[PDB]
Design a binder for this molecule. Structure first.
Ligand SMILES: [Mg+2]
Ligand SMILES: [Mg+2]
Ligand SMILES: [Mg+2]
Ligand SMILES: [Mg+2]
Ligand SMILES: [Mg+2]
Ligand SMILES: [Mg+2]
Ligand SMILES: [Mg+2]
Ligand SMILES: [Mg+2]
Ligand SMILES: [Mg+2]
Ligand SMILES: [Zn+2]
Lengths: 192, 37, 136, 23, 69
RNA sequence: GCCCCUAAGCGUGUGCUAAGUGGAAAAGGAUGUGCAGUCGCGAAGACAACCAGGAGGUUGGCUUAGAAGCAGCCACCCUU
């Protein structure tokens, strides 16, 4: 597994603060900070359409090559501020990474498969914490529940990781709990 | 005729139309015939 | 009905209906949820009504979480009383709901039935709400 | 009744700038 | 030719089937018994081979909660 | 504030509204119309219309007076 960086144009911000930031978002740009082991925070604007499309295609942890005044820098999406109501990206934290660097990242665990017919699959962890190379970060880990019967408890230690990928979350975390499907009687008691 | 603020297609043969500024549902089943008002 | 077992202060100032919810704004237990778009006091009677609507629609084979508990008391004075003579006795239990707050969550295998069930619940609530998923 | 409503609504005129005595 | 479900009933030795196809297993029926039902149903099936006809009969066994092994 | 009552624009440029909306109102209902943006299918003939096929095990188990795809419950297989 090896991901190619996605190119985004970025320009250094002339002004900082909420006034400047609100204007940037109104003109369709998202403010971002780039910070790094090199301890050299840069203040950037990204195009909102382009950045959003990258996140749709490659998930929250996409690897980007930023073009800053003509200098290409490799960076990883560290964190996103998303407005609870508008669902727009307000701000991005970008971490500078060199190739072959270990990065701790939270990845999305998808559930695939037909559980046994009387079963309900409940997912208790949306996410797991992983160590991987900058370029080897899987965009999604899939666990299969295709066969498990009631009572089974898929834990984080039981999920397939590609080569290079290490588990930082402790193995005892429940990712999937499989339970026998509630009766109508149990629905009526739950939350009464 | 049903006359209600909410008019909904009751079966898959119900068609929503606008006629003379009213929303209406016309259908082959005369029970489902209804008018916004 | 959901009532707290005890409260330290049985007569409280009204909860303030200001600001966007800073906590509980995402679906954390189920795959679908109801997200508030308006400020309201949601009472325990409305929560019960909404939850039973969801249960009836799915019949069985699903799980409903209620992310909101009505622990805020609202008082009422006895009927036909003049102003004054002390604060009324507690009468309603409400949750202070802010826009962005996820009120109900549902896990169900079928998306179509799940969305319909949550719509049935929304019509029971005093506010405007939308269906939200775990996905971005 | 409509009297109260109409009286208060007239505050939203350009000249009142959204305020008026007695609402 | 008699109903395939009734042939499964007589092959399993039970008088009524499961009310919960998945949550119950009234009995067990060898693939050999299923193949014999297929051969005796050959005048009433779309299948080309007896193997496919037996798979058809095994579909009926699933829907009525009979284990085929 | 600037058509006339009524001093000053029936001002200029580009759009929007058909409701006299403008010149009151909620939950909610709704192929109204404009602008922008995700995603599906399509010249390997899509969407609408019309011609033809839509089936065999089988009336799938259970429940019932009965239940044959079409009260209800469980499962939802296989073949040409
Ligand atoms: Mg908080
Ligand atoms: Mg009144
Ligand atoms: Mg004049
Ligand atoms: Mg003017
Ligand atoms: Mg003119
Ligand atoms: Mg003019
Ligand atoms: Mg014009
Ligand atoms: Mg008017
Ligand atoms: Mg209105
Ligand atoms: Zn109809």
């Amino acid at each position: 597994t090896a991901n190619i960086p996605n190119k985004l144009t970025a320009n250094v911000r002339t002004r900082t603060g909420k006034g400047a930031s609100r204007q940037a978002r109104r003109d369709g740009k998202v403010p971002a900070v780039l910070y790094g082991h090199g301890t050299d925070p840069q203040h950037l604007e990204l195009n909102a359409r382009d950045f959003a499309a990258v996140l749709r295609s490659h998930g929250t942890n996409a690897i980007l090559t930023l073009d800053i005044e003509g200098t290409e820098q490799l960076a990883l999406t560290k964190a996103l501020d998303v407005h609870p109501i508008r669902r727009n990206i307000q701000h991005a934290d970008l971490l500078v990474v060199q190739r072959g660097e270990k990065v701790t990242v939270e990845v999305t665990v998808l559930v695939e498969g037909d559980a046994t017919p009387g079963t309900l699959v409940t997912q208790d962890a949306n996410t797991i914490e992983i160590e991987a190379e900058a370029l080897s970060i899987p965009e999604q880990l899939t666990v299969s529940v295709e066969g498990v019967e009631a009572g089974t408890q898929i834990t984080a230690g039981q999920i397939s990781l590609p080569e290079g990928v290490n588990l930082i979350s402790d193995p005892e975390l429940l990712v999937v709990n499989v339970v026998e499907a509630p009766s109508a009687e149990a629905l009526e008691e739950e939350g009464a | 005729m049903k006359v209600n603020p909410s008019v909904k297609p009751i079966c898959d043969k119900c068609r929503v139309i606008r006629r003379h500024g009213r929303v209406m549902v016309i259908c082959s089943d005369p029970r489902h015939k209804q008018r916004q008002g | 009905m959901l009532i707290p077992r005890k409260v330290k202060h049985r007569k409280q100032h009204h909860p303030e209906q200001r600001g966007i919810a800073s906590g509980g704004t995402s679906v954390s237990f189920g795959d679908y949820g109801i997200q508030a778009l308006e400020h309201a006091y949601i009472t325990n009677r409305q929560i019960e009504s909404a939850r039973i609507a969801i249960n009836r629609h799915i019949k069985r084979g699903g799980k409903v979480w209620i992310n909101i508990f009505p622990d805020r008391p609202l008082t009422k004075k006895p009927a036909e009383t003049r102003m004054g003579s002390g604060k009324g006795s507690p009468e309603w239990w409400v949750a202070n709901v802010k826009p962005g707050r996820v009120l109900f969550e549902l896990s169900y295998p079928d998306e179509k039935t799940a969305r319909d069930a949550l719509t049935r619940a929304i019509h029971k609530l005093p506010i405007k709400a939308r269906i939200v998923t775990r996905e971005e | 009744a409509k009297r109260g409503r109409k009286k208060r609504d007239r505050k939203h005129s350009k000249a009142n700038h959204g305020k008026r005595p007695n609402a | 030719t008699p109903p395939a479900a009734k042939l499964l009933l007589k092959a399993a030795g039970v008088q009524k089937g499961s009310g919960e196809p998945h949550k119950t297993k009234v009995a067990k029926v060898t693939w050999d018994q299923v193949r014999e039902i297929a051969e005796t149903k050959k005048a009433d099936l779309n299948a080309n081979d007896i193997d496919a006809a037996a798979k058809i009969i095994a579909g009926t066994a699933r829907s009525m909660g009979i284990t085929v092994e």
